[PDB]
Amino acid sequence: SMEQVAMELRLTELTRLLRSVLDQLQDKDPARIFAQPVSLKEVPDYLDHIKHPMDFATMRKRLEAQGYKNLHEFEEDFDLIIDNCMKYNARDTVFYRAAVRLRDQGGVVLRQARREVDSIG
Secondary structure: OHHHHHHHHHHHHHHHHHHHHHHHHHHOOOOOOOOOOOOOOOOOOHHHHOOOOOOHHHHHHHHHOOOOOOHHHHHHHHHHHHHHHHHHOOOOOHHHHHHHHHHHHHHHHHHHHHHHHHHOO
């Protein structure tokens, strides 16, 4: 149908905007602490601690499958990255500190993306 096409073009355009958002958020992690999943070879007990792991590579796979239907879903996954880290790692660690800086800096980027999504429909 013409409606299913128009909806697909809306999803494609959301995917384009989310791809730019993801690139901007990932620049706020220059150390690449959040780039890939926590290794279960190197942290074999991780899943006993963290029930829903997340990382930027896993978000990028979901994105390119047009697996995010709205910004809320995408923010959910970003928030898991931060929140998982802040639970697993102690406050006095490079990991925790990197998450706090990512959260703080990403907030700005996400604030305007929410406006661009509401604005462009």
